[PDB]
Homo-oligomer: A and B are copies of this chain.
Amino acid sequence: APIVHGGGITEAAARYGGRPEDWLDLSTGINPCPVALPAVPERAWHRLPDRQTVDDARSAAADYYRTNGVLPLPVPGTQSVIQLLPRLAPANRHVAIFGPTYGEYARVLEAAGFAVDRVADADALTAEHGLVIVVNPNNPTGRALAPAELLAIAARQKASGGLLLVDEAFGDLEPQLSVAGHASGQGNLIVFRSFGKFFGLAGLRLGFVVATEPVLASFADWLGPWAVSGPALTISKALMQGDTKAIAAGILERRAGLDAALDGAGLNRIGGTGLFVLVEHPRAALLQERLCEAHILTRKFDYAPTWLRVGLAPDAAGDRRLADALARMELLE
């Protein structure tokens, strides 16, 4: 069975009742206040995506991610290039994953016959690891390695022909943590960027890969022609060239609202990012179920029974709705 990711409002409503639009979905890390849609000309809807449409999105992404001249490859969601890591990871070597983290990396790689080593820090890394994977900042804990630590990991693995993959899906709010500007100088470094979370348009399937040209050419060939939609490439070019400072500011305001609601309910926050909070509670799974009975979806983890990941609400009313559900919740037994 596939991983039960956040966002499962359809399945939650079927089990707990209510209309999907009446649920408060706090089970993802998506910006709850989507940016206004830019114009998408009819040409972008009608035609197979043109090289010019691709190139403009790549140029905007290079400026936006500060890639020091590397033109990022647009991909139809970073999930699509996660599915392709078996073709890149050095054959007959282990993969080390800084965890616990987003589950698709281990799922995809183990399904392809790779041996996956769960690690918590760099001192566990060896020459047996053909690929090292860091989600930075981490999903779901928010742990952030400094760029210098990431580059030291890369340099150490490079000696044995190992690669370092840094998934910066949740890194837009802290661009000073990014190593997306180091692809050419490091040589063995790959960076995934995700478009949906920060901009709040996760209905679009769009990410970007920053890497050396031989690696980008490989991903491009594996994905095949017309991999990313015309509308997605049009929208990302416009939004990345707009005022992203105001996007970050709005997110931090909603994060302050979530902090106040969770702290005021007596919950213990142990980590997170601008876009979600990790709560630790001895009955986290029962909290998740009781919140579902209030038609509020949050994210629980089968590997961490005391963990609850709570995303941002869209406004102060939603903050208050969360707080009231916690305050009026029935016995946790």
Contact = CB atoms under 8 A, between A and B. Distances in A.
Interface in A298-313: none
Interface string A1-12: 011010111110
Contacts of A228: 205
A79 B204 contact: no
A202 B34 contact: no
Contacts of A28: 48
A2 B50 contact: no
A318 to B, nearest CB: 14
A294 interface: no
Interface residues of A, number: 54
Q: Which 9 A-B pairs have the closest CB atoms?
A: A203-B230, A10-B51, A34-B46, A10-B52, A7-B48, A45-B203, A48-B202, A83-B224, A205-B229
Interface in A53-87: 55, 76-77, 79-80, 82-83
A3 B226 CA distance: 12
A53 B106 CA distance: 28
Interface string A191-212: 0000010001111110000000
Given A50-B9, A229-B229, A76 B76 contact: yes
A225 interface: yes
A223 B83 contact: yes
B50 A7 contact: yes
A45 B201 CA distance: 5
A52 B20 contact: yes
A239 to B, nearest CB: 12
A331 interface: no
